[PDB]
């Protein structure tokens, strides 16, 4: 929550990190104004971009099942580590020996 | 996790400027929340998907040859000379879209 | 408990109510037993140790 | 899906004026690929003709026992992959921004390549060249 | 059951020109955003 | 592969202004050809002398 806070200050940036407190719109019209060159013209006129930026993230919050891995990447590691730890422990125990 | 440590301290700190690793597009924003056993990121991209097929130059000249082109993306479209690039379309008279390199071939328009 | 030729150690409980009934215990997929039957007639559900 | 994504020239036999690229397509598995294919010793594959070609008579279609499965991609395809590669080398190496560009020939595209990081600007590339 | 697509690739090949000028696919909509990979960091202890 | 996807997408596309990965010399171009399992690189880099 503390990366959330940097996230606009930092992500700025001019070193890091030595800095700052800028608010989070602007942090995204200065890095948006820096890879998708495009510059202060089109990010005036206009915004909304906006309602295209909360719209993509409202997709990112709807979508997790299934069939959008990074999620089952993340419980194939859930079922990975659980699958080894107790399912692993089951075959270890009951039953191995002659 | 030294590749989550390079990736927040490249991808979340910074915007990064790098392809994938910061996922598929030109990368604007990334959020960093706590997964079970990992990080998990909401890497914020561009995607382009209009795509229209323009002319360039590669620069100016005129009688005297002084050039311009670019700061930093390309061209100097017709219509009549209009920059705006990378990504949407198209600008004024350049005045800040310009650093001023050596002359090229294909003399006066300068490429 | 040491039950009919099985042997193990458990904590019962009256639980709720998934079994055959007619012969007398329930296994999970394993060896173990969880693992009522036998009392008469209730459900004491067994556990590990 | 990392490798393509936009936009290529396309493969024209002409790619860079002069410079001889061997990595075109001849027409499909470019001269080089087809260099690190023959001098490669693979006694592998069979595709409906090398299972009867060694029935005819490596064994992954005979003891099974193990098998191995096709690579997901008709060569000619992981061939479509990397030509358009090929042709975005010279437009997406410009940059300004990956990707959303272009084309531009690959001459002038390894004089701003060249021009960047082996910095001799443009008096050394214009006299001259050959490079 | 209706096998046997081949569907690839296909980008969206800008053509190359010949003169001084030269073609450039530049775009008009920005559509951002996605959410992408985990990256895993541990285990369980 | 992973790091073939940061091969192609620092050394192929862009420069990329960096050593080695890039090898030996400061990178100029570089070409992929599909190899046996793998990509394969043909990084044209600058040599002084």
Same mark, same amino acid.
């Given at each position: ?8 200050? @930092? ?23 820096? @890879? ?37 990447? @993340?419980?194939?590691? @859930? ?20 | 996790?030294?590749? %989550? ?8 700190? %910074?915007? !990064?400027?790098? !392809? ?6 030109? $990368? ?14 909401? $890497? ?6 209009? $795509?229209?097929?323009?002319? !360039? ?40 879209? %310009?650093?001023?390199?050596?002359? !090229? ?5 300068? %490429? | ?26 296994? *999970? ?9 036998? *009392? *008469? ?9 | ?131 | ?45």
């Amino acid at each position: 929550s503390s990366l959330l806070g940097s996230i606009a200050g @930092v992500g700025w940036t001019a070193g890091l990190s030595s800095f700052a407190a800028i608010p989070f719109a602007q942090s995204i019209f200065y890095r948006l104004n820096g @890879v998708g060159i495009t510059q202060q013209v089109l990010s005036e006129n206009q915004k909304l971009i906006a309602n295209k930026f909360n719209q993509a993230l409202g997709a990112m919050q709807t979508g997790f099942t299934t069939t959008n891995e990074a999620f089952q990447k @993340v419980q194939d590691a @859930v079922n990975n580590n659980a699958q080894a730890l107790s399912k692993l422990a089951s075959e270890l125990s009951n039953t191995f020996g002659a | 996790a030294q590749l %989550a440590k390079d990736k927040v301290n490249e991808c979340v700190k %910074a915007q !990064s400027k790098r !392809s994938g690793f910061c996922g598929q597009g030109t $990368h604007i924003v990334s959020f960093v929340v706590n997964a079970p056993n990992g990080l998990y990121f909401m $890497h914020v991209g561009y995607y382009p998907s209009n $795509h229209i097929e323009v002319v !360039s130059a590669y620069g100016l000249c005129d009688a005297a040859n002084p050039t311009n082109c670019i700061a930093p993306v390309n061209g100097y479209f017709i219509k009549t000379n209009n920059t705006r690039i990378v990504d949407e379309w198209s600008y004024t008279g350049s005045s800040f879209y %310009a650093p001023e390199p050596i002359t !090229s071939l294909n003399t006066k328009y300068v %490429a | 408990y040491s039950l009919y030729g099985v042997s193990g150690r458990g904590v019962f409980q009256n639980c709720t109510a998934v079994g055959v009934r007619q012969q007398r215990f329930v296994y *999970d997929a394993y060896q173990n037993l969880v693992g009522y039957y036998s *009392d *008469d007639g209730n459900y004491y559900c067994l556990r590990a140790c | 899906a990392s490798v393509k994504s936009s936009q290529s020239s396309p493969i024209i036999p002409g790619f860079g004026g002069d410079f001889n690229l061997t990595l075109l397509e001849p027409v499909a598995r470019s001269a080089i690929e087809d260099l690190l294919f023959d001098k490669v010793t693979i006694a592998d594959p069979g595709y409906m003709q090398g299972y009867d070609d060694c029935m005819q008579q490596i064994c992954a279609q005979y003891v099974a026992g193990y098998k191995v499965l096709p690579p997901l991609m008709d060569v000619n395809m992981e061939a479509a992959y990397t030509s358009s590669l090929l042709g975005s080398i010279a437009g997406v190496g410009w940059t300004a921004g990956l990707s959303s560009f272009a084309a531009i020939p690959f001459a002038q595209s390894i004089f701003y390549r060249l021009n960047g990081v082996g910095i001799t600007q443009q008096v050394l590339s214009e006299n001259q060249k050959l490079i | 059951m209706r096998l046997a697509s081949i569907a690839f690739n296909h980008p969206i090949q800008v053509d190359q020109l010949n003169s001084s000028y030269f073609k450039l696919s530049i775009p008009t909509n920005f559509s951002f955003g996605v959410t992408q990979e985990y990256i895993q960091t541990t285990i369980q202890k």
